[PDB]
Design a protein around this ligand. Structure first.
Ligand SMILES: *C(C(=O)O)[C@H](O)C(=O)N[C@@H](CC(C)C)C(=O)NCCCCNC(N)=[NH2+]
Length: 212
């Protein structure tokens, strides 16, 4: 795999979103990886519905948090609608997949990255955007403005985001806190520190969709 990856530069990343007060980061992370794999496999970049996963993933807890792997499993089992068809409301509502017509996209499965393994995650990112988790509760992360972030942070992961690239000393992360946070909504998190958790626990739990 190459020294630098940046899926934005290959047209596989949609604009940065803002989840608002709702604890829906798990759905945004999953959606980033779906948009990416659909662009990679079909050539088209579309936006897909975080709200659909928020409402319809019965293993998740709506705005009280949830599981990226469960949202991705939902998209592989049923499918997902376009964001326009099922826009983001910032609150969990009834599942309306059935009332919104045929799904827009469907995947074929979900595969987990070997946790606590930097090279495995870099490999995954080299093939596609990956859903990852990290500890975002610390003030240093909350206030990140730019540069390669080294912390301080612990490994008590609490926030799902998406890895869309990397470089020799960082992994490139698409956050769901709007375009005014970080580097136009992105953070570059230091890698190569030898800490197996990853900076801010970045290697704890990583999933990606599979689409043949
Ligand atoms: C995301 C956020 O707004 O930061 C949100 O808090 C979230 O998804 N939290 C997750 C932790 C990460 C995805 C690793 C979470 O708490 N998941 C467990 C399920 C939700 C908590 N339990 C219940 N019953 N609500």
């Amino acid at each position: 795999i190459p020294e630098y990856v940046d899926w934005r530069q290959k047209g596989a990343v949609t604009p940065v979103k803002n989840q608002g007060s709702c604890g829906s980061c798990w759905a945004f992370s999953a959606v980033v990886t779906i948009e990416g794999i659909i662009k990679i496999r079909t050539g088209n970049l579309n936006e897909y519905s975080e709200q659909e996963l928020l409402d319809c993933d019965r293993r998740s807890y709506g705005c009280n948090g949830g599981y990226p792997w469960s949202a991705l499993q939902l998209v592989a089992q049923y499918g997902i609608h376009y964001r326009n068809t099922y826009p983001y409301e910032g609150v969990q509502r009834y599942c309306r997949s059935r009332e919104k017509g045929p799904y827009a996209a469907k995947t074929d499965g979900v595969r987990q990255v070997q946790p606590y393994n930097e090279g495995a995650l870099l490999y995954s990112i080299a093939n596609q955007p990956v859903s990852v988790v990290l500890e975002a509760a610390g003030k240093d992360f909350q206030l990140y403005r730019g540069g390669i972030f080294v912390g301080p942070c612990g490994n008590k992961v609490d926030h799902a985001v998406a890895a869309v690239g990397y470089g020799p000393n960082y992994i490139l992360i698409k956050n769901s806190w709007g375009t005014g946070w970080g580097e136009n909504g992105y953070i570059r998190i230091k890698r190569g520190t030898g800490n197996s958790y990853g900076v801010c626990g970045l290697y704890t739990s990583s999933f990606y969709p599979v689409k043949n």
